[PDB]
Every structure is written in structure tokens, then in C-alpha cells.
């Protein structure tokens, strides 16, 4: 059920400060609705939360520190639209990827060394056109190149100047 018939992009970012700056540029560039944002670490997910709260976004955070009931409440609320941005460390979108989500952002590329193809697919593929962004520091390009060869779908490049 699960393919890649969605527009994929990457942005080159020096450090997380630039990743968020870029993410802000996306927000001031197109209509959102709902978005999922995936991070590799608790520390980074937590950080992006604080960042977005300080910019008015209503964010909920799905880290691993949460109890079953806390996870239940976050997820239920995001599904029926009470939150707009869901930041998670979850390796996969299952349960959360409702129809209302237009954007998905890999705030960290799902990476011993090899990139995780099914993680990438579960995050970004769906089960009438999606949008997905990869926030990447210069030297993650080799992995991204592999992710692209693997799926034979091109991941286009953007900068601090969004057009589409
Ligand atoms: Cl962590
Ligand atoms: Cl399913
Ligand atoms: Zn999954």
C-alpha cells in the first residue's frame, strides 16, 4: 500500500540553528495544516520544541520519556487536529500519519553507518501530492545519495529561497 508518490527535497544546513531557520522559511512559504517532524535524538527533539514554542507554533512532542497514557493523549489530540506540529523521535509514522498532514520533515536523516531505508519509507511514504524535506549537513549527502538510488526517486535541492 506504501509508495513514494510525493515531492522530496533536501536543504544543506551547517548546524541545527540553520535547520530550524530553514524550517521557518518553509512555514513562511506555503500553507501547512499539519506536519510531522522526525528527530534522531531526544535532546534534539526537545530543543526544536522550545524553539517552536518561542515562535508561536502549537507543538506536541513524542519522545520516549512518555508513559502509555501520555502517548495516548498526544497522539489522539494530533489526529483530531488539536495540535499542528508533532515532533517525534519515533522511527515510524504508523498511527499518526493522518490525512491532514501535508508536510513531513526529517530533521535528522534516519542513519552503524548505513541509512535506514524502511525507516525513511515509513516516515515519508503514505498508505493528491505530499511534501517531504530532509535537513542535512553537507557530509550527509553520501547517505542521501544512496537513499535516492535505493528508491529511484529524485530528492531535489533547496536553499534559503523556497519556490513551488
Ligand atoms: Cl536520545
Ligand atoms: Cl498500518
Ligand atoms: Zn512502522
Residue numbers in the entry: 307 to 417, 420 to 435, 440 to 476
What text does the study give?
DExD/H-box RNA helicases, from virus and bacteria to eukaryotes, play important roles in processes including ribosome biogenesis, RNA processing and folding, ribonucleoprotein (RNP) remodeling, RNA nuclear export, the regulation of RNA translation and transcription, and nonsense-mediated RNA decay. DExD/H-box proteins often contain accessory regulatory domains and localization modules, but their cores consist of two RecA-like domains joined by a short flexible linker. The N-terminal domain is commonly referred to as conserved domain-1, or DEAD-domain, and the C-terminal domain as conserved domain-2, or helicase domain. Both domains contribute to the binding site for RNA substrates and both contribute to ATP hydrolysis. We used X-ray crystallography to determine the structures of the DEAD-domains of DDX2A, DDX2B, DDX5, DDX10, DDX18, DDX20, DDX47, DDX52, and DDX53, as well as the helicase domains of DDX25 and DDX41.
DDX25 (GRTH) is a testis specific, gonadotropin and androgen regulated protein that is essential for completion of spermatogenesis. The two helicase domains have a sequence identity of 23% and their structures superimpose with an r.m.s.d. of 3 Å. The helicase domain contributes to nucleotide coordination via motifs V and VI. A superposition of DDX19 with the DDX25 and DDX41 helicase domains shows that in the latter two structures part of motif VI is not visible in the electron density, indicating its flexibility. The conserved motifs IV and VI superpose well, whereas motif V shows different conformations in all three structures. In the free helicase domain structures motif V, an important RNA backbone interaction site is in a binding incompetent conformation.
